[PDB]
Amino acid sequence: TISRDSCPALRAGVRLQHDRARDQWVLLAPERVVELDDIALVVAQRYDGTQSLAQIAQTLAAEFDADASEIETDVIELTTTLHQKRLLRL
Amino acid sequence: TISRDSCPALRAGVRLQHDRARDQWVLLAPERVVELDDIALVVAQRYDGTQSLAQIAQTLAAEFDADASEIETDVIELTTTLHQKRLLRL
């Protein structure tokens, strides 16, 4: 966590900018790349802000003749990672 | 938190891309803008991956003839927010 003992540095590509037109200063964060492999590729495509992870897992497990409990764990794990990376709307 | 009941959607600008050259699929996250105002502007400039938040607060409070306890709270609050946004290296 962040405490008084933290010694931060801005990450690479994160730069300070004076947005004169809007009379404000901002930090510009660079575009990011997140690798998706195998089933994660399908899950990312299946997100639609409606279906739940449970539904997504049930659908995929049935489509791939895979175990639903296992797929649900994988779907939740992936979503947690993508959520941590600020890539999702819940 | 993320559970089986979550119904995610990819955020705007987050798109799926087939990086054929690297034989992988990825999610491309768009550049982001984070507003910094008043003392937060100075704090962001003071980060150097060496000085601690305690040191940064002590320095700034002395420079601005402000109360150090108050400034330390503000510095920690800001850093926590920037850390949550994945903008810092600790």
Q: How far apart are the first and last CA of chain B?
A: 24
- The domain that holds A77 is classified in CATH as 1.10.10.1150
Q: How far apart are the first and last CA of chain A?
A: 24
Residue A87, CA atoms < 13 Å, CB-side half-sphere: 25
Burial label, A7 (beta-carbon count in 10 A; 0-12, 13-18, 19+): middle
B45 sits in which H/E element? helix B39-46
Are the C-beta atoms of B43 and B24 separated by less than 8 Å? no
Instruction: Determine the structural domain holding residue B40 and report its residue range.
Output: 1-90
What span, in angstroms and rounded, lies between the C-alpha atoms of B29 and B51?
30
Resolution in A: 1.7
* CA distances, B21 to each of A38, B9, B18, B24, B30 (Å): 17, 27, 9, 8, 21
Interface of A with B in 43-62 (CB under 8 A): 44-45, 47-54, 57
Q: How many helices (DSSP H) and strands (DSSP E) are in chain A? A: 3, 5
Number of structural domains chain A divides into: 1
Return the biggest CA–CA distance within chain A. 57
Supply angle C-alpha A55, A61, A63, rounded to 5: 100
What span, in angstroms and rounded, lies between the C-alpha atoms of B4 and A25?
39
Chain B residues whose beta carbon lies within 8 Å of the beta carbon of residue A42: none
Is the alpha carbon torsion for B71, B77, B83, B85 positive or negative? negative
* Structural determination approach: X-ray
